[PDB]
């Protein structure tokens, strides 16, 4: 677990969606979505379950204020990951509602998830290629601290 | 994938609860719960996402008519699995509703998930030991074809099937 906790990664799913994650500590992540259905969305201080399945394979799972459920597996040695995201129907129907700095709009997310339809869920299971991976250390509050913008991931990769 | 698809497994939690799964084909499972809060529940022809993450590590994920979301990992060579289940609030309060041959009560599951509370959800992540594992072959409709009963897991292990 000490090899995984503290990792800062960018990855592109096979559907082309580019995501950025920071494993801030053994039960918390920050993340930033750069493209795809909810590009522009970003989140800090998401509580998560993190386990090591076996040598080189980790699992990060959580549920969100929107109702979305997520289970990710990371294979850092192979620069691969796989994610399954279970979106409530309303998120698929109105992804714009969730596209914000979520921490400023928690009440809106919870209000929406009670007021709109949940079923059937829109489930997205895909592999992704890890294109950036760095051990950034634990509890660095500055890694993910602004909204995503065009070209940001190239900047991060360029150093 | 050909090592994993067709597997019939029982896995047992630390508390003794026994869960049974059959990887019927590369996008379908049957399952049967033998003990615990939803003992008696069983399901056929559940559509799933199955992938091989790396050598010896597989992932099976799906959402259910009850609204429950599931993502399991299997590590057959180490005889271990890890599951995370995201239960709607109502399944936590009325698990008995889900205890049945689900296929005969799809309408009830869907009525329930709309009528009762969804949130807050209960996220339940736990390892289990794989305590039975047998390649039963693909698309065998006879593996999970009846409701569970006390002693059935013993019969499965003793009959290798």
mmCIF file of N, CA and C in Angstrom, chain A residues 2-139:
data_model
loop_
_atom_site.group_PDB
_atom_site.id
_atom_site.type_symbol
_atom_site.label_atom_id
_atom_site.label_comp_id
_atom_site.label_asym_id
_atom_site.label_seq_id
_atom_site.Cartn_x
_atom_site.Cartn_y
_atom_site.Cartn_z
ATOM 1 N N UNK A 2 2.027 1.245 0.587
ATOM 2 C CA UNK A 2 2.838 2.461 0.592
ATOM 3 C C UNK A 2 3.406 2.805 -0.791
ATOM 4 N N UNK A 3 3.322 1.861 -1.727
ATOM 5 C CA UNK A 3 3.746 2.105 -3.101
ATOM 6 C C UNK A 3 2.652 2.789 -3.903
ATOM 7 N N UNK A 4 1.419 2.693 -3.419
ATOM 8 C CA UNK A 4 0.269 3.169 -4.182
ATOM 9 C C UNK A 4 -0.245 4.485 -3.620
ATOM 10 N N UNK A 5 -0.324 4.538 -2.301
ATOM 11 C CA UNK A 5 -0.819 5.730 -1.629
ATOM 12 C C UNK A 5 0.197 6.837 -1.875
ATOM 13 N N UNK A 6 -0.282 8.000 -2.319
ATOM 14 C CA UNK A 6 0.592 9.098 -2.697
ATOM 15 C C UNK A 6 0.770 9.247 -4.202
ATOM 16 N N UNK A 7 0.267 8.287 -4.976
ATOM 17 C CA UNK A 7 0.412 8.377 -6.433
ATOM 18 C C UNK A 7 -0.482 9.455 -7.035
ATOM 19 N N UNK A 8 0.072 10.180 -8.004
ATOM 20 C CA UNK A 8 -0.666 11.137 -8.829
ATOM 21 C C UNK A 8 -0.641 10.560 -10.252
ATOM 22 N N UNK A 9 -1.813 10.316 -10.841
ATOM 23 C CA UNK A 9 -1.890 9.675 -12.159
ATOM 24 C C UNK A 9 -2.850 10.395 -13.101
ATOM 25 N N UNK A 10 -2.534 10.351 -14.398
ATOM 26 C CA UNK A 10 -3.466 10.723 -15.450
ATOM 27 C C UNK A 10 -3.630 9.498 -16.339
ATOM 28 N N UNK A 11 -4.862 9.239 -16.768
ATOM 29 C CA UNK A 11 -5.132 8.084 -17.611
ATOM 30 C C UNK A 11 -6.222 8.391 -18.623
ATOM 31 N N UNK A 12 -6.165 7.725 -19.774
ATOM 32 C CA UNK A 12 -7.216 7.873 -20.772
ATOM 33 C C UNK A 12 -7.947 6.556 -20.974
ATOM 34 N N UNK A 13 -9.249 6.568 -20.710
ATOM 35 C CA UNK A 13 -10.073 5.399 -20.956
ATOM 36 C C UNK A 13 -10.093 5.091 -22.440
ATOM 37 N N UNK A 14 -10.557 3.883 -22.765
ATOM 38 C CA UNK A 14 -10.616 3.411 -24.142
ATOM 39 C C UNK A 14 -11.706 4.127 -24.946
ATOM 40 N N UNK A 15 -12.622 4.780 -24.236
ATOM 41 C CA UNK A 15 -13.602 5.644 -24.885
ATOM 42 C C UNK A 15 -13.048 7.051 -25.125
ATOM 43 N N UNK A 16 -11.804 7.278 -24.702
ATOM 44 C CA UNK A 16 -11.109 8.537 -24.977
ATOM 45 C C UNK A 16 -11.142 9.550 -23.848
ATOM 46 N N UNK A 17 -11.914 9.243 -22.809
ATOM 47 C CA UNK A 17 -12.107 10.165 -21.686
ATOM 48 C C UNK A 17 -10.844 10.220 -20.824
ATOM 49 N N UNK A 18 -10.335 11.431 -20.574
ATOM 50 C CA UNK A 18 -9.100 11.611 -19.793
ATOM 51 C C UNK A 18 -9.376 12.057 -18.366
ATOM 52 N N UNK A 19 -8.833 11.298 -17.425
ATOM 53 C CA UNK A 19 -9.076 11.514 -16.011
ATOM 54 C C UNK A 19 -7.768 11.675 -15.259
ATOM 55 N N UNK A 20 -7.835 12.359 -14.124
ATOM 56 C CA UNK A 20 -6.667 12.587 -13.291
ATOM 57 C C UNK A 20 -7.033 12.269 -11.846
ATOM 58 N N UNK A 21 -6.188 11.488 -11.179
ATOM 59 C CA UNK A 21 -6.471 11.101 -9.798
ATOM 60 C C UNK A 21 -5.255 11.319 -8.903
ATOM 61 N N UNK A 22 -5.515 11.660 -7.640
ATOM 62 C CA UNK A 22 -4.450 11.764 -6.647
ATOM 63 C C UNK A 22 -4.850 10.942 -5.438
ATOM 64 N N UNK A 23 -4.048 9.930 -5.129
ATOM 65 C CA UNK A 23 -4.316 9.085 -3.970
ATOM 66 C C UNK A 23 -3.722 9.774 -2.743
ATOM 67 N N UNK A 24 -4.502 10.676 -2.162
ATOM 68 C CA UNK A 24 -3.979 11.644 -1.207
ATOM 69 C C UNK A 24 -3.541 10.980 0.081
ATOM 70 N N UNK A 25 -4.333 10.021 0.534
ATOM 71 C CA UNK A 25 -3.943 9.191 1.670
ATOM 72 C C UNK A 25 -4.688 7.859 1.600
ATOM 73 N N UNK A 26 -4.511 6.997 2.595
ATOM 74 C CA UNK A 26 -5.031 5.636 2.436
ATOM 75 C C UNK A 26 -6.555 5.516 2.452
ATOM 76 N N UNK A 27 -7.259 6.647 2.533
ATOM 77 C CA UNK A 27 -8.726 6.621 2.490
ATOM 78 C C UNK A 27 -9.332 7.866 1.832
ATOM 79 N N UNK A 28 -8.525 8.602 1.072
ATOM 80 C CA UNK A 28 -8.988 9.845 0.438
ATOM 81 C C UNK A 28 -8.382 10.060 -0.942
ATOM 82 N N UNK A 29 -9.189 10.538 -1.884
ATOM 83 C CA UNK A 29 -8.660 10.948 -3.176
ATOM 84 C C UNK A 29 -9.139 12.346 -3.544
ATOM 85 N N UNK A 30 -8.369 13.013 -4.402
ATOM 86 C CA UNK A 30 -8.836 14.181 -5.151
ATOM 87 C C UNK A 30 -8.849 13.749 -6.619
ATOM 88 N N UNK A 31 -9.747 14.297 -7.425
ATOM 89 C CA UNK A 31 -9.670 13.989 -8.863
ATOM 90 C C UNK A 31 -10.189 15.104 -9.736
ATOM 91 N N UNK A 32 -9.843 15.026 -11.017
ATOM 92 C CA UNK A 32 -10.096 16.104 -11.948
ATOM 93 C C UNK A 32 -10.381 15.444 -13.297
ATOM 94 N N UNK A 33 -11.490 15.830 -13.923
ATOM 95 C CA UNK A 33 -11.938 15.185 -15.159
ATOM 96 C C UNK A 33 -11.677 16.136 -16.322
ATOM 97 N N UNK A 34 -10.864 15.694 -17.281
ATOM 98 C CA UNK A 34 -10.386 16.602 -18.319
ATOM 99 C C UNK A 34 -11.180 16.530 -19.621
ATOM 100 N N UNK A 35 -11.850 15.406 -19.854
ATOM 101 C CA UNK A 35 -12.663 15.267 -21.058
ATOM 102 C C UNK A 35 -13.766 14.252 -20.852
ATOM 103 N N UNK A 36 -14.587 14.063 -21.883
ATOM 104 C CA UNK A 36 -15.678 13.102 -21.812
ATOM 105 C C UNK A 36 -16.960 13.715 -21.278
ATOM 106 N N UNK A 37 -17.870 12.851 -20.835
ATOM 107 C CA UNK A 37 -19.232 13.259 -20.495
ATOM 108 C C UNK A 37 -19.288 14.352 -19.425
ATOM 109 N N UNK A 38 -18.334 14.323 -18.497
ATOM 110 C CA UNK A 38 -18.343 15.273 -17.391
ATOM 111 C C UNK A 38 -17.020 16.031 -17.271
ATOM 112 N N UNK A 39 -16.361 16.229 -18.407
ATOM 113 C CA UNK A 39 -15.159 17.033 -18.450
ATOM 114 C C UNK A 39 -15.412 18.390 -17.831
ATOM 115 N N UNK A 40 -14.485 18.825 -16.981
ATOM 116 C CA UNK A 40 -14.621 20.072 -16.237
ATOM 117 C C UNK A 40 -14.939 19.844 -14.765
ATOM 118 N N UNK A 41 -15.441 18.659 -14.455
ATOM 119 C CA UNK A 41 -15.802 18.319 -13.081
ATOM 120 C C UNK A 41 -14.533 18.043 -12.282
ATOM 121 N N UNK A 42 -14.513 18.482 -11.028
ATOM 122 C CA UNK A 42 -13.399 18.134 -10.151
ATOM 123 C C UNK A 42 -13.828 18.048 -8.699
ATOM 124 N N UNK A 43 -13.088 17.263 -7.932
ATOM 125 C CA UNK A 43 -13.538 16.865 -6.614
ATOM 126 C C UNK A 43 -12.344 16.748 -5.677
ATOM 127 N N UNK A 44 -12.494 17.271 -4.457
ATOM 128 C CA UNK A 44 -11.473 17.109 -3.422
ATOM 129 C C UNK A 44 -12.016 16.367 -2.208
ATOM 130 N N UNK A 45 -11.145 15.601 -1.552
ATOM 131 C CA UNK A 45 -11.478 15.014 -0.254
ATOM 132 C C UNK A 45 -12.597 13.982 -0.338
ATOM 133 N N UNK A 46 -12.605 13.206 -1.416
ATOM 134 C CA UNK A 46 -13.545 12.095 -1.535
ATOM 135 C C UNK A 46 -13.063 10.919 -0.693
ATOM 136 N N UNK A 47 -13.869 10.509 0.280
ATOM 137 C CA UNK A 47 -13.580 9.309 1.066
ATOM 138 C C UNK A 47 -13.668 8.054 0.191
ATOM 139 N N UNK A 48 -12.693 7.163 0.324
ATOM 140 C CA UNK A 48 -12.660 5.960 -0.508
ATOM 141 C C UNK A 48 -12.227 4.742 0.295
ATOM 142 N N UNK A 49 -12.550 3.561 -0.224
ATOM 143 C CA UNK A 49 -11.942 2.325 0.261
ATOM 144 C C UNK A 49 -10.791 1.953 -0.670
ATOM 145 N N UNK A 50 -9.602 1.724 -0.115
ATOM 146 C CA UNK A 50 -8.454 1.325 -0.934
ATOM 147 C C UNK A 50 -7.879 0.019 -0.405
ATOM 148 N N UNK A 51 -7.748 -0.981 -1.276
ATOM 149 C CA UNK A 51 -7.110 -2.247 -0.885
ATOM 150 C C UNK A 51 -6.098 -2.705 -1.926
ATOM 151 N N UNK A 52 -5.134 -3.503 -1.478
ATOM 152 C CA UNK A 52 -4.213 -4.171 -2.381
ATOM 153 C C UNK A 52 -4.753 -5.579 -2.606
ATOM 154 N N UNK A 53 -5.021 -5.923 -3.861
ATOM 155 C CA UNK A 53 -5.583 -7.242 -4.174
ATOM 156 C C UNK A 53 -4.521 -8.322 -4.194
ATOM 157 N N UNK A 54 -3.349 -7.953 -4.693
ATOM 158 C CA UNK A 54 -2.221 -8.860 -4.836
ATOM 159 C C UNK A 54 -1.069 -7.990 -5.315
ATOM 160 N N UNK A 55 0.126 -8.554 -5.434
ATOM 161 C CA UNK A 55 1.264 -7.752 -5.875
ATOM 162 C C UNK A 55 0.924 -6.953 -7.126
ATOM 163 N N UNK A 56 1.069 -5.630 -7.046
ATOM 164 C CA UNK A 56 0.914 -4.763 -8.212
ATOM 165 C C UNK A 56 -0.513 -4.401 -8.621
ATOM 166 N N UNK A 57 -1.514 -4.830 -7.852
ATOM 167 C CA UNK A 57 -2.909 -4.558 -8.221
ATOM 168 C C UNK A 57 -3.658 -3.966 -7.040
ATOM 169 N N UNK A 58 -4.247 -2.792 -7.243
ATOM 170 C CA UNK A 58 -4.930 -2.091 -6.171
ATOM 171 C C UNK A 58 -6.357 -1.784 -6.592
ATOM 172 N N UNK A 59 -7.211 -1.536 -5.612
ATOM 173 C CA UNK A 59 -8.611 -1.265 -5.883
ATOM 174 C C UNK A 59 -9.041 -0.058 -5.065
ATOM 175 N N UNK A 60 -9.714 0.877 -5.721
ATOM 176 C CA UNK A 60 -10.222 2.086 -5.080
ATOM 177 C C UNK A 60 -11.714 2.191 -5.396
ATOM 178 N N UNK A 61 -12.548 2.228 -4.349
ATOM 179 C CA UNK A 61 -14.004 2.232 -4.535
ATOM 180 C C UNK A 61 -14.700 3.263 -3.649
ATOM 181 N N UNK A 62 -15.774 3.859 -4.158
ATOM 182 C CA UNK A 62 -16.488 4.868 -3.378
ATOM 183 C C UNK A 62 -17.851 5.168 -3.985
ATOM 184 N N UNK A 63 -18.681 5.879 -3.217
ATOM 185 C CA UNK A 63 -19.917 6.435 -3.732
ATOM 186 C C UNK A 63 -19.869 7.952 -3.555
ATOM 187 N N UNK A 64 -20.575 8.661 -4.425
ATOM 188 C CA UNK A 64 -20.480 10.119 -4.511
ATOM 189 C C UNK A 64 -21.766 10.820 -4.064
ATOM 190 N N UNK A 65 -21.674 12.132 -3.777
ATOM 191 C CA UNK A 65 -22.850 12.923 -3.407
ATOM 192 C C UNK A 65 -23.943 12.942 -4.499
ATOM 193 N N UNK A 66 -23.570 12.638 -5.745
ATOM 194 C CA UNK A 66 -24.512 12.538 -6.872
ATOM 195 C C UNK A 66 -25.242 11.192 -6.909
ATOM 196 N N UNK A 67 -24.731 10.222 -6.155
ATOM 197 C CA UNK A 67 -25.276 8.863 -6.183
ATOM 198 C C UNK A 67 -24.461 7.890 -7.022
ATOM 199 N N UNK A 68 -23.516 8.417 -7.794
ATOM 200 C CA UNK A 68 -22.651 7.596 -8.639
ATOM 201 C C UNK A 68 -21.801 6.672 -7.786
ATOM 202 N N UNK A 69 -21.687 5.415 -8.213
ATOM 203 C CA UNK A 69 -20.789 4.450 -7.578
ATOM 204 C C UNK A 69 -19.599 4.159 -8.492
ATOM 205 N N UNK A 70 -18.424 3.964 -7.897
ATOM 206 C CA UNK A 70 -17.203 3.772 -8.678
ATOM 207 C C UNK A 70 -16.345 2.664 -8.087
ATOM 208 N N UNK A 71 -15.821 1.794 -8.947
ATOM 209 C CA UNK A 71 -14.819 0.832 -8.525
ATOM 210 C C UNK A 71 -13.704 0.807 -9.567
ATOM 211 N N UNK A 72 -12.513 1.212 -9.139
ATOM 212 C CA UNK A 72 -11.349 1.294 -10.023
ATOM 213 C C UNK A 72 -10.307 0.281 -9.599
ATOM 214 N N UNK A 73 -9.647 -0.335 -10.574
ATOM 215 C CA UNK A 73 -8.468 -1.145 -10.302
ATOM 216 C C UNK A 73 -7.278 -0.534 -11.028
ATOM 217 N N UNK A 74 -6.148 -0.478 -10.336
ATOM 218 C CA UNK A 74 -4.927 0.074 -10.917
ATOM 219 C C UNK A 74 -3.843 -0.981 -10.985
ATOM 220 N N UNK A 75 -3.137 -1.004 -12.113
ATOM 221 C CA UNK A 75 -2.039 -1.937 -12.349
ATOM 222 C C UNK A 75 -0.837 -1.068 -12.737
ATOM 223 N N UNK A 76 -0.259 -0.366 -11.749
ATOM 224 C CA UNK A 76 0.713 0.687 -12.058
ATOM 225 C C UNK A 76 1.954 0.219 -12.796
ATOM 226 N N UNK A 77 2.418 -0.991 -12.484
ATOM 227 C CA UNK A 77 3.600 -1.555 -13.167
ATOM 228 C C UNK A 77 3.377 -1.722 -14.667
ATOM 229 N N UNK A 78 2.116 -1.906 -15.064
ATOM 230 C CA UNK A 78 1.737 -2.110 -16.453
ATOM 231 C C UNK A 78 1.170 -0.835 -17.072
ATOM 232 N N UNK A 79 1.088 0.223 -16.272
ATOM 233 C CA UNK A 79 0.554 1.510 -16.736
ATOM 234 C C UNK A 79 -0.842 1.301 -17.309
ATOM 235 N N UNK A 80 -1.610 0.450 -16.631
ATOM 236 C CA UNK A 80 -2.993 0.201 -16.998
ATOM 237 C C UNK A 80 -3.902 0.308 -15.778
ATOM 238 N N UNK A 81 -5.149 0.659 -16.029
ATOM 239 C CA UNK A 81 -6.177 0.590 -15.003
ATOM 240 C C UNK A 81 -7.506 0.186 -15.659
ATOM 241 N N UNK A 82 -8.477 -0.198 -14.836
ATOM 242 C CA UNK A 82 -9.825 -0.466 -15.327
ATOM 243 C C UNK A 82 -10.785 0.179 -14.361
ATOM 244 N N UNK A 83 -11.799 0.836 -14.898
ATOM 245 C CA UNK A 83 -12.793 1.448 -14.036
ATOM 246 C C UNK A 83 -14.200 1.041 -14.426
ATOM 247 N N UNK A 84 -15.070 0.897 -13.424
ATOM 248 C CA UNK A 84 -16.496 0.774 -13.690
ATOM 249 C C UNK A 84 -17.197 1.890 -12.937
ATOM 250 N N UNK A 85 -17.983 2.675 -13.656
ATOM 251 C CA UNK A 85 -18.716 3.768 -13.049
ATOM 252 C C UNK A 85 -20.198 3.530 -13.277
ATOM 253 N N UNK A 86 -20.960 3.548 -12.186
ATOM 254 C CA UNK A 86 -22.389 3.328 -12.237
ATOM 255 C C UNK A 86 -23.062 4.684 -12.048
ATOM 256 N N UNK A 87 -23.426 5.334 -13.151
ATOM 257 C CA UNK A 87 -24.067 6.656 -13.082
ATOM 258 C C UNK A 87 -25.578 6.511 -12.909
ATOM 259 N N UNK A 88 -26.169 7.291 -11.986
ATOM 260 C CA UNK A 88 -27.617 7.387 -11.941
ATOM 261 C C UNK A 88 -28.123 7.915 -13.283
ATOM 262 N N UNK A 89 -29.312 7.492 -13.689
ATOM 263 C CA UNK A 89 -29.878 7.944 -14.949
ATOM 264 C C UNK A 89 -29.765 9.457 -15.135
ATOM 265 N N UNK A 90 -30.095 10.219 -14.100
ATOM 266 C CA UNK A 90 -30.165 11.677 -14.224
ATOM 267 C C UNK A 90 -28.813 12.317 -14.543
ATOM 268 N N UNK A 91 -27.733 11.671 -14.119
ATOM 269 C CA UNK A 91 -26.406 12.179 -14.445
ATOM 270 C C UNK A 91 -26.118 12.005 -15.933
ATOM 271 N N UNK A 92 -26.547 10.876 -16.488
ATOM 272 C CA UNK A 92 -26.418 10.652 -17.921
ATOM 273 C C UNK A 92 -27.289 11.640 -18.697
ATOM 274 N N UNK A 93 -28.471 11.921 -18.161
ATOM 275 C CA UNK A 93 -29.432 12.810 -18.824
ATOM 276 C C UNK A 93 -29.012 14.273 -18.731
ATOM 277 N N UNK A 94 -28.396 14.646 -17.608
ATOM 278 C CA UNK A 94 -27.999 16.032 -17.372
ATOM 279 C C UNK A 94 -26.604 16.107 -16.737
ATOM 280 N N UNK A 95 -25.573 15.715 -17.494
ATOM 281 C CA UNK A 95 -24.245 15.660 -16.889
ATOM 282 C C UNK A 95 -23.765 17.045 -16.456
ATOM 283 N N UNK A 96 -24.282 18.087 -17.106
ATOM 284 C CA UNK A 96 -23.911 19.462 -16.785
ATOM 285 C C UNK A 96 -24.128 19.813 -15.311
ATOM 286 N N UNK A 97 -25.164 19.243 -14.695
ATOM 287 C CA UNK A 97 -25.439 19.522 -13.292
ATOM 288 C C UNK A 97 -24.239 19.157 -12.406
ATOM 289 N N UNK A 98 -23.537 18.077 -12.754
ATOM 290 C CA UNK A 98 -22.420 17.593 -11.940
ATOM 291 C C UNK A 98 -21.075 18.216 -12.322
ATOM 292 N N UNK A 99 -21.058 19.000 -13.397
ATOM 293 C CA UNK A 99 -19.815 19.591 -13.878
ATOM 294 C C UNK A 99 -19.548 20.915 -13.164
ATOM 295 N N UNK A 100 -18.746 20.821 -12.112
ATOM 296 C CA UNK A 100 -18.405 21.950 -11.277
ATOM 297 C C UNK A 100 -17.331 21.493 -10.298
ATOM 298 N N UNK A 101 -16.838 22.422 -9.482
ATOM 299 C CA UNK A 101 -16.052 22.032 -8.308
ATOM 300 C C UNK A 101 -17.046 21.487 -7.296
ATOM 301 N N UNK A 102 -17.138 20.167 -7.187
ATOM 302 C CA UNK A 102 -18.248 19.585 -6.457
ATOM 303 C C UNK A 102 -18.335 20.046 -5.007
ATOM 304 N N UNK A 103 -17.181 20.301 -4.394
ATOM 305 C CA UNK A 103 -17.143 20.691 -2.978
ATOM 306 C C UNK A 103 -17.963 21.939 -2.648
ATOM 307 N N UNK A 104 -18.151 22.806 -3.639
ATOM 308 C CA UNK A 104 -18.937 24.029 -3.468
ATOM 309 C C UNK A 104 -20.438 23.778 -3.661
ATOM 310 N N UNK A 105 -20.795 22.585 -4.140
ATOM 311 C CA UNK A 105 -22.180 22.287 -4.514
ATOM 312 C C UNK A 105 -22.685 20.931 -4.017
ATOM 313 N N UNK A 106 -22.236 20.508 -2.842
ATOM 314 C CA UNK A 106 -22.666 19.222 -2.299
ATOM 315 C C UNK A 106 -24.187 19.140 -2.130
ATOM 316 N N UNK A 107 -24.791 20.209 -1.613
ATOM 317 C CA UNK A 107 -26.237 20.225 -1.404
ATOM 318 C C UNK A 107 -26.991 20.080 -2.716
ATOM 319 N N UNK A 108 -26.509 20.750 -3.757
ATOM 320 C CA UNK A 108 -27.128 20.651 -5.069
ATOM 321 C C UNK A 108 -27.090 19.203 -5.573
ATOM 322 N N UNK A 109 -25.958 18.527 -5.387
ATOM 323 C CA UNK A 109 -25.843 17.136 -5.836
ATOM 324 C C UNK A 109 -26.848 16.236 -5.110
ATOM 325 N N UNK A 110 -26.972 16.414 -3.800
ATOM 326 C CA UNK A 110 -27.870 15.574 -3.001
ATOM 327 C C UNK A 110 -29.340 15.895 -3.267
ATOM 328 N N UNK A 111 -29.622 17.176 -3.472
ATOM 329 C CA UNK A 111 -30.954 17.608 -3.862
ATOM 330 C C UNK A 111 -31.347 16.969 -5.195
ATOM 331 N N UNK A 112 -30.443 17.039 -6.167
ATOM 332 C CA UNK A 112 -30.683 16.470 -7.489
ATOM 333 C C UNK A 112 -30.903 14.954 -7.454
ATOM 334 N N UNK A 113 -30.112 14.242 -6.660
ATOM 335 C CA UNK A 113 -30.194 12.780 -6.680
ATOM 336 C C UNK A 113 -31.499 12.270 -6.069
ATOM 337 N N UNK A 114 -32.128 13.081 -5.225
ATOM 338 C CA UNK A 114 -33.419 12.713 -4.639
ATOM 339 C C UNK A 114 -34.588 13.105 -5.538
ATOM 340 N N UNK A 115 -34.389 14.152 -6.328
ATOM 341 C CA UNK A 115 -35.462 14.740 -7.124
ATOM 342 C C UNK A 115 -35.601 14.157 -8.534
ATOM 343 N N UNK A 116 -34.497 13.678 -9.104
ATOM 344 C CA UNK A 116 -34.516 13.102 -10.445
ATOM 345 C C UNK A 116 -34.459 11.576 -10.413
ATOM 346 N N UNK A 117 -34.580 10.963 -11.584
ATOM 347 C CA UNK A 117 -34.633 9.510 -11.693
ATOM 348 C C UNK A 117 -33.254 8.878 -11.576
ATOM 349 N N UNK A 118 -33.208 7.694 -10.971
ATOM 350 C CA UNK A 118 -31.957 6.975 -10.786
ATOM 351 C C UNK A 118 -31.797 5.858 -11.808
ATOM 352 N N UNK A 119 -32.916 5.238 -12.181
ATOM 353 C CA UNK A 119 -32.897 4.009 -12.961
ATOM 354 C C UNK A 119 -33.554 4.177 -14.320
ATOM 355 N N UNK A 120 -33.039 3.463 -15.333
ATOM 356 C CA UNK A 120 -31.903 2.546 -15.239
ATOM 357 C C UNK A 120 -30.569 3.280 -15.207
ATOM 358 N N UNK A 121 -29.593 2.684 -14.538
ATOM 359 C CA UNK A 121 -28.287 3.296 -14.470
ATOM 360 C C UNK A 121 -27.558 3.199 -15.796
ATOM 361 N N UNK A 122 -26.647 4.139 -15.995
ATOM 362 C CA UNK A 122 -25.761 4.184 -17.140
ATOM 363 C C UNK A 122 -24.410 3.726 -16.627
ATOM 364 N N UNK A 123 -24.005 2.529 -17.043
ATOM 365 C CA UNK A 123 -22.800 1.894 -16.506
ATOM 366 C C UNK A 123 -21.680 1.877 -17.539
ATOM 367 N N UNK A 124 -20.522 2.396 -17.147
ATOM 368 C CA UNK A 124 -19.396 2.551 -18.060
ATOM 369 C C UNK A 124 -18.208 1.763 -17.525
ATOM 370 N N UNK A 125 -17.930 0.595 -18.124
ATOM 371 C CA UNK A 125 -16.756 -0.187 -17.733
ATOM 372 C C UNK A 125 -15.683 -0.192 -18.829
ATOM 373 N N UNK A 126 -14.509 0.362 -18.523
ATOM 374 C CA UNK A 126 -13.456 0.526 -19.519
ATOM 375 C C UNK A 126 -12.058 0.437 -18.929
ATOM 376 N N UNK A 127 -11.129 -0.075 -19.728
ATOM 377 C CA UNK A 127 -9.711 0.014 -19.401
ATOM 378 C C UNK A 127 -9.227 1.407 -19.753
ATOM 379 N N UNK A 128 -8.119 1.815 -19.143
ATOM 380 C CA UNK A 128 -7.448 3.048 -19.525
ATOM 381 C C UNK A 128 -5.943 2.866 -19.515
ATOM 382 N N UNK A 129 -5.257 3.645 -20.353
ATOM 383 C CA UNK A 129 -3.808 3.696 -20.338
ATOM 384 C C UNK A 129 -3.366 4.800 -19.380
ATOM 385 N N UNK A 130 -2.452 4.479 -18.475
ATOM 386 C CA UNK A 130 -1.880 5.492 -17.595
ATOM 387 C C UNK A 130 -0.763 6.227 -18.340
ATOM 388 N N UNK A 131 -0.928 7.534 -18.526
ATOM 389 C CA UNK A 131 0.009 8.317 -19.336
ATOM 390 C C UNK A 131 0.908 9.206 -18.474
ATOM 391 N N UNK A 132 0.566 9.313 -17.194
ATOM 392 C CA UNK A 132 1.391 10.031 -16.229
ATOM 393 C C UNK A 132 1.283 9.331 -14.879
ATOM 394 N N UNK A 133 2.422 9.084 -14.246
ATOM 395 C CA UNK A 133 2.404 8.487 -12.916
ATOM 396 C C UNK A 133 3.593 8.987 -12.106
ATOM 397 N N UNK A 134 3.303 9.532 -10.927
ATOM 398 C CA UNK A 134 4.337 10.128 -10.092
ATOM 399 C C UNK A 134 3.998 9.941 -8.619
ATOM 400 N N UNK A 135 4.972 9.542 -7.809
ATOM 401 C CA UNK A 135 4.707 9.513 -6.378
ATOM 402 C C UNK A 135 4.856 10.902 -5.792
ATOM 403 N N UNK A 136 3.721 11.543 -5.544
ATOM 404 C CA UNK A 136 3.690 12.944 -5.153
ATOM 405 C C UNK A 136 3.769 13.122 -3.640
ATOM 406 N N UNK A 137 3.767 12.015 -2.905
ATOM 407 C CA UNK A 137 3.713 12.089 -1.454
ATOM 408 C C UNK A 137 2.285 12.142 -0.939
ATOM 409 N N UNK A 138 2.140 11.989 0.374
ATOM 410 C CA UNK A 138 0.832 11.915 1.010
ATOM 411 C C UNK A 138 0.364 13.284 1.531
ATOM 412 N N UNK A 139 -0.942 13.527 1.458
ATOM 413 C CA UNK A 139 -1.559 14.736 2.002
ATOM 414 C C UNK A 139 -1.043 16.066 1.468
#
